[PDB]
Amino acid sequence: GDDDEPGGKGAMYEVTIEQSGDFRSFIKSVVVVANGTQLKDGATGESLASPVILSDEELAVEKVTLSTTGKAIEFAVSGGVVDGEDGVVNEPMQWVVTVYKNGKEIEKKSLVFRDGKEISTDDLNLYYN
């Protein structure tokens, strides 16, 4: 389509994020970096000009999946949250997070976030190539 350009190696990748517990009151933060290809948005399947950051409003859904339009050479997946909603008490939350390739799973995770206060935790710190 249009033209192609053979030469070299790499993969494809797809990350998921399910969002459990009280995630709707927790100002949360993610990165996505794609070597050698563009990203795709799980909401709609629109292509995206990576590298990109997801802010809390975008991460207000129950689940995201983001993937690669083509021959990717990397994934990098970091994130965390705070507790700074002017001191509202709620219940804690979780992030059930997984990473897939051009046709296999490679990472199979969860994390648990809880109340207290604002902090800085690279609580998710994943990467692949």
TrEMBL record:
The answer to whether UniProt assigns keyword Signal to this entry is yes
Where do transmembrane segments lie in this chain? none
The source's superkingdom equals Bacteria
Has the keyword Transmembrane helix been applied to this entry? no
Alphabetic keyword roster = Signal
Name assigned to this protein: Peptide chain release factor 2
* Lineage, top ranks: Bacteria, Pseudomonadati, Bacteroidota, Bacteroidia, Bacteroidales
